[PDB]
Point group: C3
């Protein structure tokens, strides 16, 4: 254990040195062991998709191609499946749910976990610290601004933000060339 | 170090394979080493309590039975103790504090750290990304919605949300059977 | 791998035991390997600065003296450099950006990443879960409250909060003696 700890620290030093030179960044220890693209592949996600070590993926989660799954994210498919499209940006700190335990806790542990399936289309952006709750359906080409709480379905080509989130305009201008 | 890195990656691959088959989930590297229930036990928390590897626990923290401490949480008892009851849901990203450093920073490093003890009762839910500040007292059977900032005490059987958080109704209906 | 996993768990147990006795806290596995002050030093940050293992630092990031970089933070200098002063508190969950990908995602992957440099002065506090977006300039002795989204420049001696953040008063009283 003495030697193992010393080896782990040596490895941390060397790997951080290598990552600074090669990738001009410094990551957590775990993100220097885990490759983002191989992890996504192991999870059955589409080609081009990437996911940080620090991400938690529960139950039935399906993800399309070229989707970026950021650090400190939760993709919870435990309550009937979560489906995410292609080309999505799932920003740092985003949490996507198909269950909750409000009643279980509030009832002293008696009530069951409530569950509902959740879907996000393609070409979406979920901004930092966005919370998407069970049951929600988000369409294609939606923007969800940072610090949102999405309680209801969102149709395609919408821009939403707030806690709770509300439709603010269409997303058309972000789709331009 | 070359061999150690290769072994760590082999271990990551195998353990993720095992966790997918056994627990239908993919966790961070650290959460495949650390057992949530043994960690809680080591921290002196009550029977049935669980805490993710990614959680930070500072100073005097006491937790009751069957409380779920989620990923990416902060339980800071450094400023006079933090006490949490039984059957609580402490959601991903929740941060509970007994100190802050606004004045220390704002004063160029001169002022002291401000401190005040914090307590949460039993049968509470703290939703994702909830921030509870020093000095606060939350009673029993409270719901705190996602994305809240709790600046003042909350009595039992309340439902609160917002930044800052405000009482919205009672929590009675969540306690049903 | 069998033996390596057993060794890692033994190390986790022992190190957590040592950290509880020596530092009265329990940290993630990675934060028991990585030293906060050596990591900051390796990143070229100023004397006295500290950064948790769980922090991500992208591209050109410069940080002054005695700045505290908390857990689960993002310091993204990838889009033209990020500069942070001395004596700053960068709270848990704070995310600071110099890029985004709204248009890249919304355009099916066609558009480029948008980039703009970001600066924060000295003696600032950024509260939990603060989001600072590309292009922003924050002056000296600013307070940013928890759960903020900072979309526009902030002058010195200001106190701001909200999503989006707005000036609420001056920060003078926090600077007192």
């Amino acid at each position: 254990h003495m030697i193992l700890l010393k080896e782990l620290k040596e490895l941390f030093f060397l790997r951080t040195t290598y990552y600074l030179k090669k990738y001009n960044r410094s990551l957590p220890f775990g993100d220097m062991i885990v490759d983002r693209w191989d992890k996504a592949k192991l999870l059955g996600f589409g080609e081009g998709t990437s996911i940080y070590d620090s991400s938690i993926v529960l139950g039935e989660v399906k993800v399309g191609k070229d989707t970026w799954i950021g650090p400190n994210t939760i993709l919870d498919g435990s309550g009937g499946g979560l489906i995410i499209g292609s080309n999505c940006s799932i920003s740092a700190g985003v949490q996507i749910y198909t269950h909750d335990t409000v009643r279980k806790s509030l009832s002293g542990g008696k009530a069951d976990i409530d569950k509902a399936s959740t879907r996000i289309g393609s070409d979406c952006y979920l901004g930092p610290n966005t919370i998407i709750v069970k049951g929600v359906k988000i369409g294609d080409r939606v923007v969800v601004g940072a610090n949102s709480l999405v309680l209801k379905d969102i149709p395609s080509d919408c821009k939403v933000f707030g806690s709770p989130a509300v439709i603010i305009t269409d997303s058309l201008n972000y789709q331009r060339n």
